Enzyme design. Structure first.
Site, PDB file in Angstrom:
ATOM      1  N   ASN A   1     -15.894  14.671 -28.983  1.00  0.00           N
ATOM      2  CA  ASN A   1     -15.116  14.208 -28.023  1.00  0.00           C
ATOM      3  C   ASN A   1     -14.030  13.402 -28.281  1.00  0.00           C
ATOM      4  OD1 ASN A   1     -15.486  11.322 -26.752  1.00  0.00           O
ATOM      5  ND2 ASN A   1     -17.374  11.575 -27.736  1.00  0.00           N
TER       6      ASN A   1
ATOM      7  N   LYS B   1     -20.077   4.298 -17.460  1.00  0.00           N
ATOM      8  CA  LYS B   1     -18.995   4.459 -18.349  1.00  0.00           C
ATOM      9  C   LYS B   1     -18.040   3.152 -18.811  1.00  0.00           C
ATOM     10  CE  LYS B   1     -15.825   6.677 -20.484  1.00  0.00           C
ATOM     11  NZ  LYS B   1     -15.798   7.372 -21.751  1.00  0.00           N
TER      12      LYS B   1
ATOM     13  N   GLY C   1     -28.504  11.263 -31.415  1.00  0.00           N
ATOM     14  CA  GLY C   1     -29.260  12.461 -31.909  1.00  0.00           C
ATOM     15  C   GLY C   1     -30.575  12.623 -31.190  1.00  0.00           C
TER      16      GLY C   1
ATOM     17  N   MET D   1     -12.423  11.684 -25.286  1.00  0.00           N
ATOM     18  CA  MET D   1     -12.273  11.561 -23.820  1.00  0.00           C
ATOM     19  C   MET D   1     -10.849  10.693 -23.606  1.00  0.00           C
ATOM     20  SD  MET D   1     -14.638  13.470 -23.131  1.00  0.00           S
ATOM     21  CE  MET D   1     -14.892  13.023 -21.156  1.00  0.00           C
TER      22      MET D   1
ATOM     23  N   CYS E   1     -13.810   0.803 -29.922  1.00  0.00           N
ATOM     24  CA  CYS E   1     -12.455   1.353 -29.627  1.00  0.00           C
ATOM     25  C   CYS E   1     -11.632   1.511 -30.946  1.00  0.00           C
ATOM     26  CB  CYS E   1     -11.756   0.465 -28.557  1.00  0.00           C
ATOM     27  SG  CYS E   1     -12.559   0.540 -27.160  1.00  0.00           S
TER      28      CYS E   1
ATOM     29  N   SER F   1     -20.740   7.155 -31.362  1.00  0.00           N
ATOM     30  CA  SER F   1     -20.080   8.430 -31.989  1.00  0.00           C
ATOM     31  C   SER F   1     -19.759   8.294 -33.482  1.00  0.00           C
ATOM     32  CB  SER F   1     -19.388   9.428 -31.049  1.00  0.00           C
ATOM     33  OG  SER F   1     -18.065   8.723 -30.875  1.00  0.00           O
TER      34      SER F   1
HETATM   35  C1  LIG Z   1     -18.028  12.578 -23.266  1.00  0.00           C
HETATM   36  C2  LIG Z   1     -18.844  11.535 -24.015  1.00  0.00           C
HETATM   37  C3  LIG Z   1     -18.306  10.182 -23.677  1.00  0.00           C
HETATM   38  C4  LIG Z   1     -18.723   9.007 -24.194  1.00  0.00           C
HETATM   39  N1  LIG Z   1     -18.076   7.866 -23.711  1.00  0.00           N
HETATM   40  C5  LIG Z   1     -18.673   6.516 -24.132  1.00  0.00           C
HETATM   41  C6  LIG Z   1     -18.093   5.314 -23.577  1.00  0.00           C
HETATM   42  O1  LIG Z   1     -17.361   5.291 -22.540  1.00  0.00           O
HETATM   43  N2  LIG Z   1     -18.719   4.209 -24.139  1.00  0.00           N
HETATM   44  C7  LIG Z   1     -19.311   4.129 -25.110  1.00  0.00           C
HETATM   45  O2  LIG Z   1     -19.625   3.077 -25.599  1.00  0.00           O
HETATM   46  N3  LIG Z   1     -19.930   5.553 -25.893  1.00  0.00           N
HETATM   47  C8  LIG Z   1     -19.470   6.686 -25.548  1.00  0.00           C
HETATM   48  N4  LIG Z   1     -19.940   7.816 -25.895  1.00  0.00           N
HETATM   49  C9  LIG Z   1     -20.698   7.774 -27.015  1.00  0.00           C
HETATM   50  C10 LIG Z   1     -22.146   7.648 -26.717  1.00  0.00           C
HETATM   51  O3  LIG Z   1     -22.562   6.704 -25.765  1.00  0.00           O
HETATM   52  C11 LIG Z   1     -23.086   7.785 -27.901  1.00  0.00           C
HETATM   53  O4  LIG Z   1     -23.031   6.544 -28.556  1.00  0.00           O
HETATM   54  C12 LIG Z   1     -22.905   9.131 -28.569  1.00  0.00           C
HETATM   55  O5  LIG Z   1     -22.561  10.258 -28.057  1.00  0.00           O
HETATM   56  C13 LIG Z   1     -23.997   9.373 -29.824  1.00  0.00           C
HETATM   57  O6  LIG Z   1     -25.305   9.548 -29.118  1.00  0.00           O
HETATM   58  P1  LIG Z   1     -25.651  11.184 -28.835  1.00  0.00           P
HETATM   59  O7  LIG Z   1     -25.947  11.391 -30.183  1.00  0.00           O
HETATM   60  O8  LIG Z   1     -26.909  11.190 -28.085  1.00  0.00           O
HETATM   61  O9  LIG Z   1     -24.535  11.971 -28.237  1.00  0.00           O
HETATM   62  C14 LIG Z   1     -19.554   9.008 -25.404  1.00  0.00           C
HETATM   63  C15 LIG Z   1     -19.938  10.113 -25.872  1.00  0.00           C
HETATM   64  C16 LIG Z   1     -19.538  11.467 -25.358  1.00  0.00           C
HETATM   65  C17 LIG Z   1     -20.271  12.547 -26.083  1.00  0.00           C
HETATM   66  C1  LIG Z   2      -6.109   7.880 -27.258  1.00  0.00           C
HETATM   67  O1  LIG Z   2      -7.338   8.526 -27.718  1.00  0.00           O
HETATM   68  C2  LIG Z   2      -8.326   7.751 -27.680  1.00  0.00           C
HETATM   69  C3  LIG Z   2      -9.482   8.212 -28.143  1.00  0.00           C
HETATM   70  C4  LIG Z   2     -10.721   7.664 -28.034  1.00  0.00           C
HETATM   71  C5  LIG Z   2     -10.949   6.535 -27.456  1.00  0.00           C
HETATM   72  C6  LIG Z   2     -12.138   6.051 -27.431  1.00  0.00           C
HETATM   73  C7  LIG Z   2     -12.356   4.764 -26.588  1.00  0.00           C
HETATM   74  C8  LIG Z   2     -13.891   4.058 -26.559  1.00  0.00           C
HETATM   75  C9  LIG Z   2     -14.744   5.121 -25.317  1.00  0.00           C
HETATM   76  C10 LIG Z   2     -15.413   5.922 -26.210  1.00  0.00           C
HETATM   77  C11 LIG Z   2     -15.147   7.260 -26.127  1.00  0.00           C
HETATM   78  C12 LIG Z   2     -14.165   7.906 -25.223  1.00  0.00           C
HETATM   79  O2  LIG Z   2     -14.005   7.604 -24.204  1.00  0.00           O
HETATM   80  O3  LIG Z   2     -13.398   8.726 -25.779  1.00  0.00           O
HETATM   81  N1  LIG Z   2     -16.051   8.186 -26.773  1.00  0.00           N
HETATM   82  C13 LIG Z   2     -17.023   7.833 -27.686  1.00  0.00           C
HETATM   83  O4  LIG Z   2     -17.550   8.904 -28.128  1.00  0.00           O
HETATM   84  N2  LIG Z   2     -17.019   6.530 -27.377  1.00  0.00           N
HETATM   85  C14 LIG Z   2     -16.254   5.733 -26.711  1.00  0.00           C
HETATM   86  O5  LIG Z   2     -16.760   4.309 -27.289  1.00  0.00           O
HETATM   87  C15 LIG Z   2     -11.485   4.187 -26.196  1.00  0.00           C
HETATM   88  C16 LIG Z   2     -10.175   4.735 -26.335  1.00  0.00           C
HETATM   89  C17 LIG Z   2     -10.035   5.836 -26.817  1.00  0.00           C
HETATM   90  C18 LIG Z   2      -8.511   6.314 -27.064  1.00  0.00           C
END
Ligand SMILES: Cc1cc2nc3c(=O)[nH]c(=O)nc-3n(C[C@H](O)[C@H](O)[C@H](O)COP(=O)(O)O)c2cc1C
Ligand SMILES: COc1ccc2cc(CCc3c(C(=O)O)[nH]c(=O)[nH]c3=O)ccc2c1
Ligand SMILES: Cc1cc2nc3c(=O)[nH]c(=O)nc-3n(C[C@H](O)[C@H](O)[C@H](O)COP(=O)(O)O)c2cc1C
Ligand SMILES: COc1ccc2cc(CCc3c(C(=O)O)[nH]c(=O)[nH]c3=O)ccc2c1
Lengths: 313, 313
Positions: B68, B44, B251, B70, B131, B196
């Site tokens: 998401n 993560k 995807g 998160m 970010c 995403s």
């Molecule tokens: C619950 C969730 C948490 C994620 N947290 C991160 C993260 O911490 N860092 C990151 O680089 N991408 C994060 N992503 C993005 C995924 O790594 C990925 O780039 C994105 O979901 C697209 O891929 P997928 O189509 O297979 O979902 C997260 C995605 C989801 C759905």
């Molecule tokens: C206060 O609201 C937010 C919302 C989303 C945020 C996302 C990031 C980067 C971590 C990340 C997240 C996530 O942790 O929400 N989700 C993804 O789909 N890709 C990511 O790279 C980092 C900080 C974030 C802060």
């Protein structure tokens, strides 16, 4: 229970219309859209001179949507102007004319000419900002200084209410900046969100090949792929542009998709890929579907739920 | 016939791994990903200090994908560093650690500490350039001067090969600019495309409500909605970054989807939404399905078709 709406000093039987570029390029297309049960129609985005567009195949559709690199094929401005001034039957429904000049000067020249027809017949302008400018620069609406330039000059040259077709944005700082730019222009009375999601790439696994010929297969995405993106843009602008209408466009295949758009804040609802795929019959289905959802919820008009999407806390 | 490959000086049993954020937050998650048939895993994205993240509900999935917000919930950098340093069994598969500091300084302080563990154990860095806020500033990867700064500082501080996690772009000019920035940095050896799709909005018709609580329901999209976006970005970077690897993300639900990523140029293939939904069993199915497509086409290796998507004329 009612789909009627009144806006921009026009009356619409329902909120549905084609998306620019779909079923709107030729006189035959426009007549067909006029004969449909759509509430309105929009002409293909035009240039001063007629254009052949890009090489074929340049559009393809799939279960979850479409990709296109049409390259602005169109019969030229004179044709769409004549359709607006002499051929369109305004007693049937209103007409939008979409313009997509390749420079600010080409846009200014078309708008100056459109103005008297808009004043006299009530054709409504939709200026396509999700459009190429200098190659190696981003499209106009991704370049906020070019966008400002285009809106200043078109507002001056046109002098009448118009709207803008916007590409999707993906970043809150962009929503913020873009809406602030639009809000500098009182004549921009409606904002259409969204154009195709740019430069996606569809690859056929069997043939190991891209599916469209221009630009090494890269092209704009429409359809199911883009509904959440489209809803996000509608609502982002709805919330930031309280003095403007927002028209929704992206991923509408059903009355339920239309309902979500409207909840997000949409006034008019445009239909692209699903209309290209299904044909103009789609409009009766969308109307019947939307009216069914309204009946079940007890809503009698569109204003009872437009923009009323709930958030959590 | 096996899907083994070598890159970045590590051996991988197959090209599959989780996407950062999915099944990788806790020791339990990482142990589970290690015991899977994946070829690698990534932690993560972390910050210096632990974070609770955003209020729940903050993730939701649907037949076409997920949304998401998160908010970077994580155990903090000390925990992932300790996992990398003392807990991970490198005899099972390689480990990537994702870092996502909220400023350049935070990033620099983490990478300086990671460097000796990377040297000693072979943990690989994935720097998350994806970010977003501070109202009025775009996320770092959409601000090319900030991106250049982050990479300058991190390369100086870290001094070893690393990779970057990129958000999608939508405009060819941005591909040319973003890739040119990345190519200024010889230590950037892999580029992961894509994060995403930013700030989409899912609305439930029945409740008339958005489906996640943070940010008025706006959040990043994954899954089926984003496959062609993801393919375009992989290919765009693969074309532009001939001295780097590209890792595909976005995807993937099937061996077919993985096949398309690799045709587009992917070396590794990351699985996010589909892994969240199906669980880690997904990796055996994906391997089987990809080998099955290979056998049918007569391909013995991934090298034979990586990056070999065909264009038309
Ligand atoms: C619950 C969730 C948490 C994620 N947290 C991160 C993260 O911490 N860092 C990151 O680089 N991408 C994060 N992503 C993005 C995924 O790594 C990925 O780039 C994105 O979901 C697209 O891929 P997928 O189509 O297979 O979902 C997260 C995605 C989801 C759905
Ligand atoms: C206060 O609201 C937010 C919302 C989303 C945020 C996302 C990031 C980067 C971590 C990340 C997240 C996530 O942790 O929400 N989700 C993804 O789909 N890709 C990511 O790279 C980092 C900080 C974030 C802060
Ligand atoms: C074949 C095709 C042609 C298009 N041409 C135009 C155009 O000339 N002007 C324009 O503003 N948008 C154009 N678009 C974009 C559509 O108007 C619409 O914004 C986009 O397809 C998303 O809606 P959908 O998901 O219903 O397809 C075109 C789309 C398609 C598929
Ligand atoms: C590579 O050559 C090209 C490719 C795409 C071009 C797109 C436009 C804008 C018109 C337009 C088109 C279109 O005509 O290709 N397609 C869309 O999905 N949305 C649009 O707004 C205009 C010119 C274009 C030229």
């Amino acid at each position: 229970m009612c789909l009627k709406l009144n806006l921009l000093d026009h009356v619409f039987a329902n909120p549905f219309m084609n998306a620019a570029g779909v079923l709107c390029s030729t006189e035959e297309d426009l007549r067909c859209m006029t004969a449909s049960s759509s509430g309105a129609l929009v002409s293909k985005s035009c240039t001063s001179a007629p254009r052949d567009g890009n090489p074929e195949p340049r559009y393809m559709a799939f279960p979850l949507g479409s990709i296109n690199s049409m390259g602005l094929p169109n019969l030229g401005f004179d044709f769409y102007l004549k359709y607006a001034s002499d051929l369109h039957d305004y007693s049937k429904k209103p007409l939008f004319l979409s313009i997509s000049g390749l420079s600010v000067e080409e846009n200014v020249a078309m708008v100056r000419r459109l103005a008297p027809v808009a004043q006299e017949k009530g054709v409504l302008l939709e200026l396509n900002l999700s459009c190429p400018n200098v190659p190696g620069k981003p499209q106009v609406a991704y370049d906020f200084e070019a966008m400002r330039t285009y809106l200043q000059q078109v507002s001056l040259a046109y002098g009448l209410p118009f709207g803008v077709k916007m590409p999707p944005y993906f970043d809150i700082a962009h929503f913020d900046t873009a809406a602030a730019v639009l809000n500098e222009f009182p004549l921009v009375k409606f904002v259409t969100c969204v154009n195709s999601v740019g430069n996606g790439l569809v690859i056929d696994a069997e043939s190991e090949s891209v599916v469209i010929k221009p630009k090494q297969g890269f092209g704009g995405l429409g359809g199911k792929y883009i509904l959440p993106t489209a809803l996000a843009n509608v609502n982002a602008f709805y919330r930031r542009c309280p003095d403007k209408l927002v028209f929704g466009c992206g991923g509408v295949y059903s009355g339920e998709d239309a309902f979500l758009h409207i909840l997000a804040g949409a006034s008019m609802v445009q239909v692209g890929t699903a209309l290209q795929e299904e044909g103009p019959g789609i409009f009766t289905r969308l109307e019947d579907e939307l009216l069914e959802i309204m009946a079940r919820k007890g809503y009698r008009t569109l204003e009872e739920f437009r923009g009323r999407v709930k958030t959590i806390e």
